[PDB]
Amino acid sequence: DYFADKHLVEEMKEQQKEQETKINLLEKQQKEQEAKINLLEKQQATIINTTKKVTEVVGRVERKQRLFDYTELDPSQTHYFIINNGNIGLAGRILSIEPIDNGSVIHLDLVNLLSIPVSNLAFNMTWGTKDLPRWKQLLLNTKMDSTIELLPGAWTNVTLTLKGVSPNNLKYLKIGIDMENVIFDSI
Amino acid sequence: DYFADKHLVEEMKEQQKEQETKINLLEKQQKEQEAKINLLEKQQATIINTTKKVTEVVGRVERKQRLFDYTELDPSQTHYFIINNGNIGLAGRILSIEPIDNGSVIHLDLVNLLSIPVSNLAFNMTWGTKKPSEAKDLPRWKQLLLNTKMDSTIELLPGAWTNVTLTLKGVSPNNLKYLKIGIDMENVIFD
Amino acid sequence: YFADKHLVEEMKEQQKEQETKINLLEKQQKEQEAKINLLEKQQATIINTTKKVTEVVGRVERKQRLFDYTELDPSQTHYFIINNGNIGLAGRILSIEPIDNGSVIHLDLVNLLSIPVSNLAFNMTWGTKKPSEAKDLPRWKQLLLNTKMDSTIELLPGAWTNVTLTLKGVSPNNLKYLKIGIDMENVIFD
């Protein structure tokens, strides 16, 4: 009763053997999983980096594409400017800004850069001061339809009435072209 | 005998201690791998989101670039159109769409928007039925599209509306709702 | 001579505990295997999407490049166009001549617009041929020469006008790269 049964210990040895095999398989599978995991990590880093690069490039391109959607300027510090939507090219020269009942009035000359006339252009305009959300809420906007005839190479007089802002506060202007009713001839 | 041998039991105990070591190692490794897997899953969710956004932006930007490559229109719902590739600017006005044997003929005027004459322009043209509104219908539609290159020795003087005829076989006027037209610049001459 | 009973009892207990631990570890191994499979598949998909995206972005970049400036090999080019989205110019190279410590490009420029433009400035970079290999680029760039040509040239609409570009540091036969762009600061429209 001080000592152990031989057969019981034999069974123990067999069990220890089976455990040995199991432990082996576990170690092996563990190495496999380690490899796969490392591979996954590195691939992920690569993806994140490449994505980073792509977003930067695409941001630059978007930024440059903005130039065809509209023209932004400070009418207090600009004489000549250009409006180009990829179809119609116009040049503008600001003659003067004058106060009129509640707001400002921009007198300017517009000129059709093309070889054929363009008529009945409409202008999308937003204006204000030189911030992000309220400065955007403090911007007024409108679409000016026109019957203006722009003959090729001819500086033509145009008046932009902008209510709500005095001349000395008028330091922001975003202007774009609406081509809904455009006719490529004399009106 | 009837009892277990001492030495054999010592051997077994030693192998058991060894097994204890290996087991402890396996547990530790299992835990760290668990942690790594967690991280990988979270990071993957983020990656899926971010990639979705990126694809979204790239799509728009690339679409915007297509406006200079060629001009797309429904000739049945269009009078004026513009072709501009960054070098040559042309305007066009559709006078009429006429039926021929198994096709349509478009009579139009083209005009050079620039200040110097351009000559020997070639036109890449693709035409057919209306552009399908669903993405799954795209490949079949593309396979059904008709294409050709119109070589013209037409000289376009600055500002002068000039008569041009596009013969498009394969599609009747009432089915002709897609026209894609671009400029080939290989043999273009400025003067 | 004989093994101790107590020691053996202890050994059986510990062996049983080992058995439980091993079972748990096998279970966890299965779970981890499944999760790893998921991760691998999703990541293959992602890698594909990313590959396509980079592919597209490349062509986009190399296209906005054409609005940014005009790149050419003046030894292989007669006619060319410069267009920054506002001003359109057409150029024809008449000759390239060697001068003191460089080359001179005689060319005709013509304003593609309907109004005259004046006081154009030109940003110019020039040098030896742009190499095909992409690894050679960062070194080839270092060796490029640059300058800004300020002008009082009046470009009337549709009128081919003589312009001379003096480019020091490179002989005519070695002048195979010219990058030219428009500076718009002092542009006057008369």
Numbering used by the authors:
A (entry chain C): 23 to 152, 159 to 215
B (entry chain A): 23 to 213
C (entry chain B): 24 to 213
Sentences from the paper on this structure:
SadB is a trimeric lipoprotein located in the inner membrane of Salmonella spp., with homologs in other enterobacteria, including pathogenic E. coli species.
To obtain the structure of SadB, a construct lacking the N-terminal signal peptide and replacing the lipid-modifiable cysteine residue Cys-22 by a serine residue was created. The resulting protein was solubly expressed in the cytosol without the lipid anchor. Like SadA, SadB is a homotrimer; it is held together by an extended N-terminal coiled coil of nine heptads, which leads into three separate globular C-terminal domains of β-sandwich topology, each composed of two antiparallel β-sheets. In this variant of the Ig fold, the first sheet has the strand order β-1, β-8, β-5, and β-6, whereas the loop connecting β-5 and β-6 is especially long and includes a short α-helix protruding toward the N terminus.
